[PDB]
Amino acid sequence: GHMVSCSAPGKIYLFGEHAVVYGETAIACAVELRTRVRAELNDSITIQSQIGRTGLDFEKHPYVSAVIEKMRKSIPINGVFLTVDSDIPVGSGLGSSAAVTIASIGALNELFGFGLSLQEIAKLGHEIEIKVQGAASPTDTYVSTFGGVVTIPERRKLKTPDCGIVIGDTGVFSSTKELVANVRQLRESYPDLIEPLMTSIGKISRIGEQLVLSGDYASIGRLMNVNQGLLDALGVNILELSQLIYSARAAGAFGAKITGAGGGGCMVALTAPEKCNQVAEAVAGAGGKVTITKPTEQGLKVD
Amino acid sequence: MVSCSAPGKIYLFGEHAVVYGETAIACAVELRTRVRAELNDSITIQSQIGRTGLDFEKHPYVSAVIEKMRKSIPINGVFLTVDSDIPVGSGLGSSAAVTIASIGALNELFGFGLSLQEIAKLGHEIEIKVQGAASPTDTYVSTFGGVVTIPERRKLKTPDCGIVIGDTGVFSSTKELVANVRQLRESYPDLIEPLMTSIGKISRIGEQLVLSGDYASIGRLMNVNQGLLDALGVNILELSQLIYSARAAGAFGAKITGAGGGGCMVALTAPEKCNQVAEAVAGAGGKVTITKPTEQGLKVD
Ligand SMILES: C[C@@](O)(CCOP(=O)(O)O)CC(=O)O
Ligand SMILES: C[C@@](O)(CCOP(=O)(O)O)CC(=O)O
């Protein structure tokens, strides 16, 4: 008869977004922007977050409701009160939906003693995102479960960079599905042109793998800038993203690029700790909601 | 008193990749350099820069044109008055245009009898003497006009579109920009060289789109080309702001034209949306020049 709190981090793409869906490598990096889910025993099912208080509700709380629906089939959950707080803004490729999924599983696993392992939690989180989105990659829930720097799809763990991470949100809503659809149709229109560009994005991630293992942050940011041009060439860049990205580079960032589907949302700037604040001021001065964070090895943890 | 004009040009696709044996598509625009040539007591060359004599410093291309040509038919009193609406830099062909417009103006009065052929060979050999070394592409496109592929040098039909050139006002050294791309290519050759091939592939596809008049596909291939150049590091904030403002205003496509690092962008518009696009580029802070493609190179005005 008590309460339990769990948190799971978000992530940013160092390299390789959009190209993964065509079988190329990418490098995801968990950051210290987390979603907390606090769980208590209750008479009925209640979920409260930024967008209000609901019961079981697949319109407002689809991921948390799906988690409850699934896990109640092994150990029955007749009542629970879940409170969701997050530093990960819904939108862009920061993994907010995967963070709340993993944290909801972790809290319930602790509250009702499901005894699930971290591997089982990541596998369950992937299935939750499939039943909510129709089809989902296991990448988001895996990185939010284990933290750190993970390559996709090999799941190679790399050394977490001793770096600052500046996230500039353009405020435009990043609708992932249509941007992935826009890239696919561009790929279909010019196959011999776009498909090699997908090979080049994968080539960047494989080169960047050693640079992440070597700690060469200046080379990493340089390759991030090359990755940004290819993402721009694929059509997922916008004026606001370009303005935040170039403002961050001018203020001394190693590199800056879109993170996620693009077409709005957030960019990411890898900066040395000494340059975080002035990079954050430049992105803000360019009209961007700035978040100063850093990578993390901590995935799902019990608060 | 005669007057001749030669046009500038813009790159539809392929800049920066031509050095590494790739294809490019230049398109002459209706921005021309017109020089008045008449008879005078001394060889006087006037411009917006000023009125001088035979000055190989303030008038490098015009004065060198005088020297190479007078060795066949001696000239001693000409009043050259260059006038141009071609912005300086960004490979817009300002130096190439002022060259052939001078050669054609002297070929008129003093009767040199040069072909259109010869006005291109001499117009390129003179750029070899002025800036030490130069490519004949900038020169030829100013002589014939229209859409010209490089290096295959095939002429294509002119797209019935508008051209919005947006100057950022930022200076950039093309020598440094080419060398920077060169260093990046040698730092990651297995990565950057395929990007050079992709640019050339855009030019090959774009050739069929220029022939078919698929202006919308040309524009979206321009947007792809722009991302590749941005990946090579030749893009800046000001260029990106002008490019995306043109796209949001309805242009078929927008991209850097020339070396990048500043300088000018270019936007392909439907003829009706040409002013709407130009207003957005100016509203984004660009020095706008409204123009359109031309099929005529050097003409005796
Ligand atoms: C759009 C995509 O390329 C990256 C964005 O990831 P997310 O859906 O924002 O978590 C998805 C993928 O790579 O599979
Ligand atoms: C980038 C580039 O295509 C720009 C050409 O402009 P210009 O007419 O040479 O000034 C030159 C190059 O191919 O390196």
Numbering used by the authors:
A (entry chain A): -1 to 301
B (entry chain B): 1 to 301
Q: What's in the article?
A:
In particular, the structure of 5-phosphomevalonate represents the first crystal structure of any MK bound with its product. The phosphate group, however, interacts with Asp138, a catalytically important residue discussed in greater detail below. Once the phosphoryl group is transferred to form 5-phosphomevalonate, our structure of product-bound MmMK depicts few structural alterations upon product formation.
A key regulatory step in the mevalonate pathway is the ATP-dependent phosphorylation of (R)-mevalonate to (R)-5-phosphomevalonate catalyzed by the enzyme mevalonate kinase (MK), a member of the galacto-/homoserine/mevalonate/phosphomevalonate (GHMP) kinase family. Distributed widely across eukaryotes, bacteria, and archaea, the mevalonate pathway consists of seven enzymes that convert three molecules of acetyl-CoA to isopentenyl pyrophosphate (IPP) and dimethylallyl pyrophosphate (DMAPP), the isomeric, five-carbon precursors to all steroids and isoprenoids.
